[PDB]
Amino acid sequence: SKPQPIAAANWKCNGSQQSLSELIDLFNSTSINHDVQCVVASTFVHLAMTKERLSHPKFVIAAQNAIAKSGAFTGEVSLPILKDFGVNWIVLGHSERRAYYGETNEIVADKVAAAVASGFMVIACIGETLQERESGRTAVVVLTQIAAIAKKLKKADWAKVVIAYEPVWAIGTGKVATPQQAQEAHALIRSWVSSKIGADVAGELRILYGGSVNGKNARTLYQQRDVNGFLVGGASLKPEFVDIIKATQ
């Protein structure tokens, strides 16, 4: 007994008008019987194509990042612009941003808080690196990341929030993540919420697995108690994403 799952595709910084147009087609064709919220995070450049072309009812569009206020920030995109453009979902705190683009826990927190204020559905991303994991700091890192976010939110605000746990330790390091491992990080997340904010919020909360998912291991992964879905990377530019959606039943 879980809440509404989410199948989110993060296309990352990839795609051509041609290649994504076809994807969108496959997607619009998919027969999805159950209650699943499907998401497509395109680049900023592709949002308009993606808006016109996604006709599927179970699918919404999401951005891959934003900054809270419009103004003198050459190359950046703000919340109000996305709001006016009719984007209502957004991915924040993605590890790649945390790594290459100076995204601290506090910077992330501000973004989430700003988004929730604007009325966005937010997929906020947390997860520890290998070094962190290997030093026995999984708990401390992860709970810190959620706590920084939590600081800027009222109870009410939680309804607009989705947590995606990214096992950075397993991503591009040579390591394998198991379903039990996933579940463990997940559990811990829920625990902290449950305790700090409340059981009600906790049960309503969506925790997404944001590691290596493919159409083969996605049902086994969904099988775990605190796995509400996936934040997908690689298999999101592929047909396989449909199986991924189907695994949420």
Place this chain on the structure above:
Amino acid sequence: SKPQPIAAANWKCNGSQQSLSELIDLFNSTSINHDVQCVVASTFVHLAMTKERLSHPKFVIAAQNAIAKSGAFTGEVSLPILKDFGVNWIVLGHSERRAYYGETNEIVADKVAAAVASGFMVIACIGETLQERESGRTAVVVLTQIAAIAKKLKKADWAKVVIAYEPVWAIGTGKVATPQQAQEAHALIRSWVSSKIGADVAGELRILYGGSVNGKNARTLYQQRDVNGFLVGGASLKPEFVDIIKATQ
């Protein structure tokens, strides 16, 4: 005598569909009688709308930033995507990116060399800080900036390149440089080019001025020998942009 000037609108992280379409309607409406290349730099989100409605033959569209390669860069936009979409101009190394988002002299040179290799027309930004100018180290800052970019370029590559000189202290402050300051700055940059690269190149290079340029003051600035145009933020959201265009020749 002077190469063909550029008047570029740096919209920065601003706009709404309604508001931008208005600017565009005016733009289109305007009669430009002289040989000038007008550039419009919109957010990624707006490249669609802009490219679709902008009909004026003397205007081109430009992106405000990018990264060189596609891949796993959540939130970013790569040259290949831009190219695929129809963009051939790009503003790189803007000071806002150097301050806020970690863009080093090396990081700029790297984006510049790439963009030029992909076939873009690049507007490269260089400039000193308030601090730097007050200690009298301007000449040092600019030449290092310009020199970092040169390092990665071929002589033929200079054909695709446009240098914008944007003293950071003049950026959105009202504190515009005087025609003498702009001129000494520009002449210094030109001198570096003719020396290190070649007089051929130097004579053809367009060096634009940026920092509190408005309808009133543009005229005088342009009157300077080595000032080939402007890069305009704030005034480019208004109709006065029209005057700025007409201030060149």
